[PDB]
C-alpha cells in the first residue's frame, strides 16, 4: 500500500470512527483490557482535571488484573495529571 493511499484510508477510518463515536456506545471495558493485558501497560497517565479514568483503571485492576499483575510482576503505576503531577514529571520531593 502506497503511503498516500495509506493516509487516505487512515483518514477515512478515523473520520468514520469519530463520526460514529457519539452515536455508538463507548467500549471502555475492551479499551482497558487492550491497554492493560495486550500491551501490559506499566504506567497509566490520565489527562484530566480529576482522576476519573485513573480510578476506573484502578478499579479494573483490583477487579480483574490482580493475579495477572502479581504473577508477571507488572508494577502498574496509575498516575493522574491533577494529583500525580510529581510522578508524571519526575519531580520527587527531596
Amino acid at each position: 500500500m502506497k503511503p498516500e493511499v495509506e493516509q487516505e484510508l487512515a483518514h477515512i477510518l478515523l473520520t468514520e470512527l469519530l463520526a460514529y463515536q457519539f452515536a455508538s456506545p463507548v467500549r471502555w471495558i475492551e479499551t482497558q483490557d487492550v491497554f492493560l493485558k495486550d500491551f501490559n501497560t506499566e504506567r497509566v497517565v490520565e489527562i484530566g482535571p480529576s482522576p476519573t479514568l485513573a480510578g476506573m483503571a484502578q478499579r479494573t485492576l483490583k477487579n480483574k488484573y490482580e493475579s495477572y499483575d502479581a504473577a508477571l510482576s507488572l508494577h502498574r503505576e496509575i498516575l493522574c495529571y491533577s494529583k500525580d503531577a510529581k510522578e508524571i514529571y519526575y519531580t520527587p520531593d527531596p
Binding site: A10, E16, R27, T31, V34, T41, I47, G48, Y89, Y90
Partner: protein, 835 residues
C-alpha cells in the same frame, strides 16, 4: 607458558631492531612489530636514534595483522565508505561477551521458550573491523600505539528491535570528521549496523592520535548543527531572510509572515589550516510549522564557500533564531544508585570476545613502550560494564528499554580496580529518560562519564471525557507552562475572532450568563458565524437542517448564553474547555519530553478528540475547538427541549455490583434491552466502564426511571423468566409514565443519575445525525494532517476498542458495529487500494 616477547638484534652495521612480538593474535601466529633504530658510534652521547621513516606504517601494519583479517592495504580514500564483513550472532558469542563484560541480565541469558537477545555493547564486537579500519588510511596518519579512545556511543534507530541471537548484521563505517587539533588528531567514526537491509543502530567512536599533525588537506569535519527555530514576526525578518543567498525556497512567493521556520543544517568544512576553513558548506531543509504543530519542508539552506573563517549561516541562526534542545533537564537530578564494579585481573577475556587485540591491554612490554601506567584495561570493557549496570538499575534489567548510551573515557583504567559509578536521572529526550553517570576510580578520579537514553515503561495516555469540568481548570498550567499558554491562547483567540467569547474567561470565571454583542463590523462577522451554525440530520432519508440559535438574524444586536449555575457546565463550553486543558497538559508534557514515541492512547468521549489532537496532531487547536464547540452546541438542539430548556432524555450510572452479586454485564444488558423493547421507549448502555462495577445507561429520563426502579426491585428481591421480567418492567413503567415529562431521576441504591446531562449521546438515538456530522468532521480534519505512523498501533477508538490498524479486518470490524456505505465500498475495492 613462556613465549618470546622482544627480540633485540642488529640487522646491519647500524640498524638495531627491536622486534616486539605479540603472541595474542587472531590465528595464534605471533606478530612482530619491528622498531628500527640507527646506531651512530660517532655520536657517543646519544648513539641510538629512532628511525621515524616508515615507523607509523610498520605500527599500522602490525595493528592491521592483529585487528583486521583482510590483505594489508592502506592506500584507500578515507572519504570512501568502509564495508565490514557480514557477521552472524551466535549463542556462544553472546554468552562469552556477557560473561566477559559482567552482563547478568536475563535477556542475554538463554532461557527455555524464549529468544535470546544480544547486548547493545555487542555492536562494537560486530563492527570493530570497520570502525577501527576507519583510522588506518595513510591520509589519516598517526601512531596507533599512541591512540586514545576518547568516547564511544550507541544509538538504536526508532522502531528497530534490539540485536538477537542468529541475526546477520552488516556494518558500514564512515569517517564523520577528522580534524587536526594542536594536541592531536581527532577521528570520528560512525558505524551503521543493519539487519535484513534495514538499519538497526549507529555506533559513534572518537579516536585521538596524540601528536603534531599539519596535514590539513586530509582533514574534514561534518557536523549536524542543532536545529534552529525562528519566528517571523515582521517583514523586516522576511527581507533579512531573502537577502541571504543560502536561504532558498521552493515557492518563492511563500508567505513567511507569522510563521515559525525550523532549520536542520549540516555543515561540512574542509580545513586549510588550524583556524581557517578551506571550504565551508552548510546544507539542510527549511521547514515551516503548520497549525497542527507539524514541520513540513518549504525550502532549503544551501551555503557554499571557499576559504572562510566560519559558517555565517550558523552565526545568523544563533543570533536571530533560537536553538531547539531535544534534551530537557528536570527541575532537579534524581539519584538512582551508586554501584561498585571491578575491573578484571586480565583483559584477555574481553580482548578475545570483542576482537580488540590491542597489545596495550594484554602485553606488559607494549604498554611500557606506549608509556602507559600499566596493562590498562579496555575502555570498551568499562563502557560495557557501566551499561550493564545502567540497564540493570535505570532500566530495571530490560535490554530493549535502553536505546542510547554514550560514554567518554576521560582517564585510563588499570586491572583489579574498584570503579564507583553514580547513576542519575537528569532529563528526558523524546520520552526517553536521560541518565548521566560518572564512574570514578579508587583515587576519586573520574575515569568514565556519559549519557544513557532509557525508554520509559510502557505508557498509555487515557483522556477523560465530559463530567469533571470545574472553574479554574488548567489555569495553574496556564500560568506556569509556556506550551499550555500557547494552546490556550490560540484557542481563546480563535473563539474571540469567530464567536466573540473567551474560553479562558469562561474557564476562569464560570459566568452564569454570557452576552455576545453584534455591534460593528466585527460583531456582524460574529453574528454571521453564529447564524451559519446549523444542526443537520439525515432522518428517514431526508436531510433536515435545523438552525442553532434561531433567535439570531440580521437584526439581532446580541445573543445571550444562559446557565442555571455556570456556563462552564454547558456542553457548548464544557467540551472545549476540557479538550483544551487536556491538550495543554499533554503539550506541556511534550515540551518537557515526557511522551514516549511508542506510547499508546485512548480517550473517553470528547476525550478521544483530545487524544487525537494530542498524540497524533490530526487537527490543530483551532479545528479542535471548532469541532468540539460545534458538537456541544448541536447537543442543544439534538433533543426536543421544552420551553424551559429541559429535554426528556438523560443518563444514569448503573452499578451491577450494588444490586446483587449475581448481576453481571450480561444480566444488566438483558434487563435493559427487555425494558426498552417491552416498554417501547429508548434506553441502552452507552459506556461500558468497569466490569460489573460501573456502567452508564442513556435514553429517556422516564425510561431510565423505570430501569432504576426495576433494578431497585431486583435488589429488594432475588421465556418464563422473560415474562416475569416483563411484569416487573410493566409495573415500573406504569408507575413512572404518569410523571410530567421534565422529571428528575431519583438516585437508586445502584443507579446514580448524572447531573448536567440532558442528551443521550453514545446511543442509537443520534444515528440519523452521523452522516452530516461525518461531513463536518471531514471539513475540519484534513487528510494530509492524518499521520498513519502516529495513529497505528497506538490509538484505541471507542467504536472499535482495538488498536488502530489500517487493515481489512479492522474495516470489517467497523461495519460489524456500525454499517456505513464508504466502509463497504472500501472493503469491496480493497484489492484495488492495496495495489
Amino acid at each position: 607458558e613462556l613465549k618470546p616477547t622482544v627480540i633485540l638484534k642488529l640487522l646491519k652495521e647500524n640498524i638495531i631492531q627491536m622486534e616486539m612480538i605479540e603472541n595474542r593474535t587472531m590465528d595464534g601466529k605471533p606478530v612482530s612489530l619491528p622498531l628500527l633504530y640507527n646506531f651512530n658510534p660517532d655520536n657517543g652521547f646519544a648513539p641510538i636514534s629512532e628511525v621515524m621513516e616508515d615507523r607509523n606504517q610498520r605500527i599500522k601494519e602490525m595493528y592491521w595483522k592483529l585487528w583486521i583479517d583482510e590483505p594489508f592495504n592502506l592506500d584507500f580514500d578515507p572519504r570512501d565508505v568502509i564495508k565490514g564483513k557480514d557477521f552472524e550472532i551466535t549463542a556462544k558469542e553472546v554468552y562469552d561477551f556477557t560473561h566477559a563484560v559482567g552482563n547478568n541480565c536475563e535477556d542475554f541469558v538463554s532461557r527455555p521458550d524464549r529468544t535470546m537477545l544480544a547486548p547493545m555493547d555487542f555492536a562494537i564486537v560486530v563492527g570493530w573491523r570497520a570502525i577501527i579500519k576507519a583510522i588506518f588510511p595513510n591520509t589519516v596518519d598517526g601512531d596507533l600505539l599512541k591512540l586514545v579512545h576518547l568516547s564511544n556511543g550507541y544509538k538504536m534507530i526508532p522502531g528497530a528491535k534490539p540485536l538477537q541471537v542468529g541475526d546477520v548484521v552488516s556494518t558500514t563505517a564512515v569517517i564523520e570528521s577528522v580534524v587536526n587539533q594542536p594536541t592531536g588528531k581527532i577521528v570520528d567514526v560512525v558505524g551503521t549496523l543493519s539487519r535484513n537491509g534495514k538499519p538497526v543502530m549507529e555506533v559513534t567512536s572518537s579516536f585521538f592520535y596524540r601528536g603534531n599533525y599539519t596535514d590539513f588537506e586530509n582533514t574534514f569535519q561534518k557536523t549536524v548543527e542543532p536545529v534552529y527555530q525562528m519566528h517571523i514576526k515582521t517583514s523586516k525578518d522576511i527581507a533579512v531572510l531573502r537577502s541571504k543567498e543560502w536561504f532558498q525556497l521552493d515557492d518563492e512567493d511563500f508567505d513567511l509572515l507569522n510563521k515559525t521556520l525550523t532549520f536542520e543544517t549540516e555543515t561540512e568544512v574542509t580545513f586549510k589550516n588550524a583556524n581557517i576553513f578551506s571550504s565551508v558548506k552548510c546544507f539542510g531543509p527549511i521547514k515551516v510549522e503548520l497549525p497542527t504543530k507539524e514541520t513540513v519542508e518549504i525550502g532549503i539552506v544551501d551555503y557554499e564557500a571557499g576559504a572562510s573563517h566560519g559558517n555565517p549561516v550558523v552565526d545568523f541562526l544563533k543570533r536571530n533564531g533560537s536553538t531547539l534542545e531535544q534534551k530537557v533537564n528536570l527541575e532537579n537530578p534524581i539519584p538512582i544508585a551508586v554501584l561498585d564494579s571491578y575491573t578484571p585481573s586480565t583483559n584477555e577475556p574481553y580482548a578475545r570476545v570483542s576482537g580488540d587485540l590491542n597489545p596495550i591491554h594484554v602485553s606488559r612490554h607494549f604498554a611500557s613502550y606506549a608509556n602507559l601506567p600499566g596493562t590498562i584495561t579496555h575502555g570498551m570493557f568499562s563502557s560495557a560494564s557501566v551499561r550493564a549496570l545502567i540497564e540493570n538499575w535505570a532500566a530495571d534489567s530490560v535490554s530493549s528499554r535502553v536505546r542510547g548510551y554514550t560514554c567518554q573515557f576521560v582517564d585510563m583504567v588499570l586491572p583489579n580496580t574498584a570503579l564507583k559509578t553514580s547513576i542519575q536521572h537528569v532529563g528526558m529526550i523524546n520520552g526517553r529518560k536521560l541518565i548521566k553517570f560518572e564512574t570514578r576510580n579508587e583515587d576519586d578520579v573520574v575515569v568514565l562519564t556519559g549519557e544513557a537514553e532509557i525508554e520509559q515503561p510502557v505508557t498509555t495516555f487515557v483522556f477523560t471525557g465530559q463530567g469533571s469540568q470545574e472553574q479554574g481548570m488548567g489555569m495553574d498550567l496556564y500560568k506556569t507552562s509556556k506550551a499550555a499558554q500557547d494552546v490556550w491562547n490560540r484557542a481563546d483567540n480563535h473563539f474571540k475572532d469567530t464567536y466573540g467569547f473567551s474560553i479562558l474567561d469562561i474557564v476562569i470565571n464560570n459566568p452564569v450568563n454570557l452576552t455576545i454583542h453584534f455591534g460593528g463590523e466585527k460583531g456582524k462577522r460574529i453574528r454571521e458565524n453564529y447564524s451559519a451554525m446549523i444542526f443537520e440530520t439525515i432522518v428517514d432519508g431526508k436531510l433536515k437542517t435545523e438552525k442553532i440559535f434561531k433567535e439570531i438574524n440580521e437584526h439581532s444586536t446580541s445573543y445571550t448564553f444562559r446557565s442555571e449555575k455556570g456556563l462552564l457546565s454547558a456542553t457548548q463550553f464544557t467540551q472545549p474547555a476540557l479538550t483544551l486543558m487536556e491538550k495543554a497538559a499533554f503539550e506541556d508534557l511534550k515540551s518537557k519530553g515526557l511522551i514516549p514515541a511508542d506510547a499508546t492512547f485512548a480517550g473517553h468521549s470528547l476525550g478521544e478528540y483530545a487524544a487525537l489532537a494530542s498524540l497524533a496532531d490530526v487537527m490543530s487547536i483551532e479545528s479542535l475547538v471548532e469541532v468540539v464547540f460545534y458538537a456541544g452546541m448541536t447537543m442543544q438542539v439534538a433533543v426536543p427541549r421544552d420551553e424551559l430548556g429541559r429535554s426528556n432524555y438523560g443518563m444514569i450510572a448503573i452499578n451491577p455490583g450494588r444490586v446483587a452479586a449475581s448481576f453481571s454485564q450480561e444480566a444488566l444488558q438483558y434487563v435493559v434491552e427487555r425494558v426498552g423493547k417491552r416498554t417501547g421507549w429508548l434506553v441502552e448502555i452507552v459506556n461500558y466502564n468497569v466490569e460489573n462495577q460501573q456502567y452508564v445507561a442513556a435514553g429517556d429520563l422516564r425510561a431510565l426511571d423505570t430501569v432504576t426502579n426495576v433494578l431497585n426491585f431486583i435488589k429488594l428481591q432475588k421465556e418464563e423468566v422473560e415474562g416475569h421480567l416483563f411484569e416487573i418492567i410493566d409495573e415500573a413503567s406504569k408507575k413512572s409514565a404518569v410523571k410530567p415529562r421534565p422529571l428528575k431521576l431519583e438516585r437508586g441504591f445502584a443507579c446514580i443519575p448524572l447531573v448536567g446531562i440532558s442528551v443521550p449521546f453514545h446511543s442509537t438515538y443520534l444515528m440519523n445525525g452521523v452522516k452530516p456530522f461525518k461531513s463536518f468532521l471531514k471539513k475540519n480534519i484534513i487528510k494530509e494532517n492524518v499521520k498513519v505512523a502516529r495513529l497505528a498501533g497506538k490509538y484505541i477508538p471507542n467504536l472499535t476498542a482495538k488498536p488502530f490498524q489500517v487493515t481489512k479486518e479492522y474495516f470489517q470490524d467497523v461495519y460489524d458495529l456500525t454499517g456505513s456505505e464508504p466502509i463497504k465500498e472500501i472493503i469491496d475495492n480493497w484489492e484495488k487500494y492495496e495495489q
